[PDB]
Amino acid sequence: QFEERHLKFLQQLGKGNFGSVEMCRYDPLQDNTGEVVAVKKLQHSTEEHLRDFEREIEILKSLQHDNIVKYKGVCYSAGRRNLKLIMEYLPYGSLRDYLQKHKERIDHIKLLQYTSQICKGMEYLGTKRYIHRDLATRNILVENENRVKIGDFGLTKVLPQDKEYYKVKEPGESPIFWYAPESLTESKFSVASDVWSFGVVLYELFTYIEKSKSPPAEFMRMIGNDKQGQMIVFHLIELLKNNGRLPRPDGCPDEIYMIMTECWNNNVNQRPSFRDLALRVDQIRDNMA
Ligand SMILES: Cc1cnc(Nc2cc(F)c(C3CCN(C)CC3)c(F)c2)nc1Nc1ccc(F)c(N2CCCS2(=O)=O)c1
Numbered sequence: 001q002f003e004e005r006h007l008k009f010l011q012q013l014g015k016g017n018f019g020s021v022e023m024c025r026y027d028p029l030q031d032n033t034g035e036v037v038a039v040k041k042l043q044h045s046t047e048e049h050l051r052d053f054e055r056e057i058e059i060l061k062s063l064q065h066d067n068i069v070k071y072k073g074v075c076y077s078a079g080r081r082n083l084k085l086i087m088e089y090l091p092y093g094s095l096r097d098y099l100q101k102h103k104e105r106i107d108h109i110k111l112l113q114y115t116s117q118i119c120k121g122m123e124y125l126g127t128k129r130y131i132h133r134d135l136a137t138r139n140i141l142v143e144n145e146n147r148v149k150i151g152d153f154g155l156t157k158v159l160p161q162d163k164e165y166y167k168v169k170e171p172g173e174s175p176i177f178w179y180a181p182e183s184l185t186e187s188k189f190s191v192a193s194d195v196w197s198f199g200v201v202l203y204e205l206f207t208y209i210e211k212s213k214s215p216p217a218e219f220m221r222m223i224g225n226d227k228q229g230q231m232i233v234f235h236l237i238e239l240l241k242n243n244g245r246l247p248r249p250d251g252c253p254d255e256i257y258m259i260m261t262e263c264w265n266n267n268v269n270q271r272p273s274f275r276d277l278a279l280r281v282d283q284i285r286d287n288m289a
Contacts, residue, residue: 007075008034010025019042022039036089069141112281118140131159134152165188167187213250222244
């Protein structure tokens with residue numbers, strides 16, 4: 001759909017797990033009438049990454065929801081190598097940076113608005129049996145002050161038809177401080193591990209991304225900063241099996257922290273569903289208004 005000769009580079013937006021994203025202008029008339037778009041590409045176009053990137057593209061194309069970043073197309077040159085994914089451009093960047101920069105205008109009601117939008121997006125993913133696997137505020141984007149969207153599907157897996165978990169071990173470093181215990185121990189990913197990660201996202205939101213209060217800082221302080229290398233993971237595992245948890249963020253109401261701790265159940269089957277999470281969050285939001 002998009003021809004790369006018209007994809008005009010404006011800046012690099014971010015560099016992630018085997019991918020990078022650039023802000024470009026698609027200007028096929030070359031008269032500065034084209035629209036600004038986001039362009040995702042691989043930084044090493046090997047074949048596992050190309051096939052996984054094709055899976056990611058197909059997954060994003062199959063999703064249409066107010067709280068999921070919009071797929072716009074693909075662009076290739078030289079016979080389908082250098083595949084690029086074209087997406088809508090969201091002008092406010094990640095929810096992590098946005099929250100860090102506007103923490104004194106964003107009150108609790110607004111945090112719960114974002115929360116409820118994230119839960120609706122995640123429930124829509126669950127209806128397609130997609131497991132996102134990388135839920136974090138750095139991965140949620142801000143369209144405007146009233147709308148956020150889940151935004152990076154590079155790790156998203158489709159559940160097998162006969163099971164409710166997906167076992168995956170990738171080469172790479174892993175956002176272990178967002179991982180459910182069964183994901184750390186058995187590499188099992190499910191809707192319930194996405195619910196654990198969502199609990200961590202709720203924590204993040206209510207810390208307003210204060211630097212010492214991030215999940216990596218809190219967990220490294222809890223287990224001890226002398227842990228170093230693979231051994232860190234080991235200690236984290238013990239911390240979670242002895243019911244060590246991230247603390248209640250400053251100013252967080254007890255109801256919200258209880259939602260968080262209910263999402264951090266060691267028992268996979270006792271974690272709430274995203275529909276219930278949305279219902280509780282919406283009722284709290286209505287109580288506050
Ligand atoms: C699809 C999409 C649409 N619009 C936008 N708008 C956007 C607007 C911005 F002002 C910024 C920043 C704000 C902060 N300073 C540094 C400069 C500009 C920005 F970073 C993004 N971004 C999108 N995606 C995206 C962006 C950035 C990413 F790192 C990743 N990721 C793929 C590798 C890891 S990642 O999965 O996080 C996806």
